Amino acid sequence: HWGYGKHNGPEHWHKDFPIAKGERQSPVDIDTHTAKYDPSLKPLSVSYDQATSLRILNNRHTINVRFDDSQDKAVLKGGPLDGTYRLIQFHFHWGSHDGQGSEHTVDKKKYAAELHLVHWNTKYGDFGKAVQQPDGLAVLGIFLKVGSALPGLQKVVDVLDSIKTKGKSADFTNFDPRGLLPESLDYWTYPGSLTTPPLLESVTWIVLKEPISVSSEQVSKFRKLNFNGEGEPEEPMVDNWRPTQPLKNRQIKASFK
Ligand SMILES: [Zn+2]
């Protein structure tokens, strides 16, 4: 099974998922000098006040917080998007040390971690239909930068010990994801893919320019998660990021002048 090891990591994925070498792959390097302000982008609308978190899960690849997506309780709209995208889940990618971890880079700089809030196009009816379509998904990407602790994250770090090994999950109600947004919604956007298998080219990426701040101590708790299941050889869940892929014939737009 795919993973982030020497034998099953990003360099291997193409053998089971040949779209790994496709024309709209993610993540990418964002070159801030050449991404152009686009005036046709509408205002971005992140509306998460009625979000209903359900459960948190270690799936052997990351930790993910799943939400009730039965109605428009948490949606992303505007910016490059047409129509309404419902929030389904958020997860993270992070490194074995604070100098790497993010999937997107900005002028080749890596952050300590990246948060991905995953939304699907309500016109396709559910996540599983949506993920098969070019305009099916929208992922809001937010960098984590080492500094002051973020209170908004502390409820996640606090439960990590209960989901240390793969397959483990826990109740995770009343978590408000607005606590994971920076002040600014300035963003870059480009058409891309899922950054994990099956690497489907169904994602409009919206990557916020402003990182949220997390402490060294908070990121370290992520590093005590495990890829392995209970009682197998330990394998710390670190460096669960895919390297940047070639932009090819795509445009990164900026939302801001
Ligand atoms: Zn898997």
Swiss-Prot record:
Consequence when changing residue 61 to A: Reduced CO(2) hydrase activity, rescued by 4-methylimidazole (4-MI). Reduced proton transfer. Enhanced proton transfer. Enhanced proton transfer capacity
Result when mutating residue 103 to D: Normal CO(2) hydrase activity
Coiled-coil boundaries: none
GO biological process, one term: carbon dioxide transport
Outcome of substituting residue 195 to D/E: Strongly reduced activity, but enhanced zinc affinity
Outcome following mutation: residue 15 to E: In Jogjakarta
Active site: 61 (proton donor/acceptor)
Residues that bind Zn(2+): 91, 93, 116
pH dependence: Optimum pH is 6-8.
Record comment: activity regulation: Activated by X-ray, histamine, L-adrenaline, L- and D-phenylalanine, L- and D-histidine, L-His-OMe and beta-Ala-His (carnosine).
SMART domains: Carb_anhydrase (SM01057)
This protein's UniProt keywords: Acetylation, Cell membrane, Cytoplasm, Disease variant, Lyase, Membrane, Metal-binding, Osteopetrosis, Phosphoprotein, Zinc
GO MF term set: arylesterase activity; carbonate dehydratase activity; cyanamide hydratase activity; zinc ion binding
CDD domains per record: alpha_CA_I_II_III_XIII
Binding site for substrate: 195-196
Reactions this protein catalyses: hydrogencarbonate + H(+) = CO2 + H2O; urea = cyanamide + H2O
Miscellaneous notes: Target of drugs used in treatments against glaucoma disorder and breast cancer.
Functional description taken from the UniProt entry: Catalyzes the reversible hydration of carbon dioxide. Can also hydrate cyanamide to urea. Stimulates the chloride-bicarbonate exchange activity of SLC26A6. Essential for bone resorption and osteoclast differentiation. Involved in the regulation of fluid secretion into the anterior chamber of the eye. Contributes to intracellular pH regulation in the duodenal upper villous epithelium during proton-coupled peptide absorption.
Protein name: Carbonic anhydrase 2
